[PDB]
Amino acid sequence: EDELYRQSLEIISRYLREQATGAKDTKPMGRSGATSRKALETLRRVGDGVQRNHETAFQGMLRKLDIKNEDDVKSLSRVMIHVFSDGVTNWGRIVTLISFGAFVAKHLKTINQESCIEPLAESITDVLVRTKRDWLVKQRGWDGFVEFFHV
Ligand SMILES: O=C(O)c1ccc2c(c1)N(CC1CCC1)C[C@@]1(CCCc3cc(Cl)ccc31)CO2
């Protein structure tokens, strides 16, 4: 089974859901739990910082995207491919990708479209894993992510 995909989705989905609801998911992690847990703490530390350091730009992009419903949520995939995939890859850009995703997740809860959060996480995961697998594998996937941002 695609273990990198399954782990990426669990990490991305949990962070987005946690950001939108303000509550942690106490369910156990699936495979590679130890790493996923550390990846999630890393995201809470760096991801949260990103949303604040670039709050104005994030607010601006969100406005441009004008997300009001599911169709708008589905249009985000083309934009992620355009902006994220078509560029040099580094952990910072992957953190921005996921961090803005969490920014969007919070928005979805403000407009009572919370059911779109998991489909959004799936879309982010597709872009990340399906267009940057080689890079991710070379950088040791999530173990590498945790090591890169190690305190
Ligand atoms: O600058 C970078 O290194 C960079 C790297 C990645 C990245 C972005 C910028 N952007 C653009 C920025 C401007 C403020 C947010 C958000 C992005 C595009 C817009 C749709 C979208 C939708 C979702 Cl759910 C998540 C990410 C994205 C694509 O992920």
From Swiss-Prot:
One of its GO terms (molecular function) is protein transmembrane transporter activity. Keywords: Apoptosis, Cytoplasm, Developmental protein, Differentiation, Isopeptide bond, Membrane, Mitochondrion, Nucleus, Phosphoprotein, Transmembrane, Transmembrane helix, Ubl conjugation. It is found in: Membrane; Cytoplasm; Mitochondrion; Nucleus, Nucleoplasm. Induction: Expression increases early during phorbol ester-induced differentiation along the monocyte/macrophage pathway in myeloid leukemia cell line ML-1. Rapidly up-regulated by CSF2 in ML-1 cells. Up-regulated by heat shock-induced differentiation. Expression increases early during retinoic acid-induced differentiation. There is a cross-link at residues 24, 27 (Glycyl lysine isopeptide (Lys-Gly) (interchain with G-Cter in ubiquitin)). Cleaved by CASP3 during apoptosis. It comes from the Eukaryota. GO terms for biological process: cell fate determination; cellular homeostasis; DNA damage response; extrinsic apoptotic signaling pathway in absence of ligand; intrinsic apoptotic signaling pathway in response to DNA damage; mitochondrial fusion; negative regulation of anoikis; negative regulation of apoptotic process. GO terms for cellular component: Bcl-2 family protein complex; cytoplasm; cytosol; membrane; mitochondrial outer membrane; mitochondrion; nucleoplasm; nucleus. A motif (BH3) lies at residues 39-53. Involved in the regulation of apoptosis versus cell survival, and in the maintenance of viability but not of proliferation. Mediates its effects by interactions with a number of other regulators of apoptosis. Isoform 1 inhibits apoptosis. Isoform 2 promotes apoptosis. Belongs to the Bcl-2 family. Interacts with HIF3A (via C-terminus domain). Interacts with BAD, BOK, BIK and BMF. Interacts with PMAIP1. Interacts with BBC3. Isoform 1 interacts with BAX, BAK1 and TPT1. Heterodimer of isoform 1 and isoform 2. Homodimers of isoform 1 or isoform 2 are not detected. Isoform 2 does not interact with pro-apoptotic BCL2-related proteins. Interacts with RTL10/BOP. Interacts with BCL2L11; may sequester BCL2L11 to prevent its pro-apoptotic activity. Interacts with GIMAP5 and HSPA8/HSC70; the interaction between HSPA8 and MCL1 is impaired in the absence of GIMAP5. This is Induced myeloid leukemia cell differentiation protein Mcl-1. It comes from Homo sapiens. The lineage of its organism: Eukaryota, Metazoa, Chordata, Craniata, Vertebrata.
